[PDB]
Design a protein around this nucleic acid. Structure first.
Length: 84
RNA sequence: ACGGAGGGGUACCACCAGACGUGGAGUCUGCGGCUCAAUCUGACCCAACGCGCGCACCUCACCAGGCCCGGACGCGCGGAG
């Protein structure tokens, strides 16, 4: 919302969140969506291991650098690996 | 400007007197022609032809074949499901 832009200068996607949710390299989690099999996978993998849910799916597209400025794109993710 | 017009001068890239040569053979090299898929091109009296500073690959354009975008920057659409 404010300093997050500092961080981006984190990941988005199933293939890259799993690859950082496990092995305990992650940080914080923020769920979303369309299908349970993508809602109760991570959540159950959150059951083992931080686990949180942000109110909206779009602001992730906003907070993250998925825009160019105008065309925000939704994208659920839950891995703040960098967290520098 | 030219003159198989005249008069003055001048030079071993002109001559007198001589000397050393080339054109005769074998060979290095370049130039035309023939050949090939290609035998890459410029220059042709003085004022083109060991000259464009040594070509197995690059040099290298030419022939037979094959990799890559190494398409900046703006606008429109899509994109981390």
């Amino acid at each position: 919302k404010e300093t997050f832009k500092r961080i981006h200068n984190l990941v988005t996607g199933h293939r890259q969140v799993f690859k950082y949710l496990e092995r305990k390299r992650a940080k914080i989690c923020f769920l979303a969506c369309e299908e349970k099999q993508y809602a109760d996978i991570v959540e159950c993998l959150c059951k083992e291991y931080h686990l949180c849910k942000k109110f909206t799916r779009r602001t992730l597209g906003e907070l993250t650098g998925q825009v160019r400025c105008i065309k925000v794109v939704p994208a659920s993710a839950c891995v703040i690996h960098n967290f520098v």
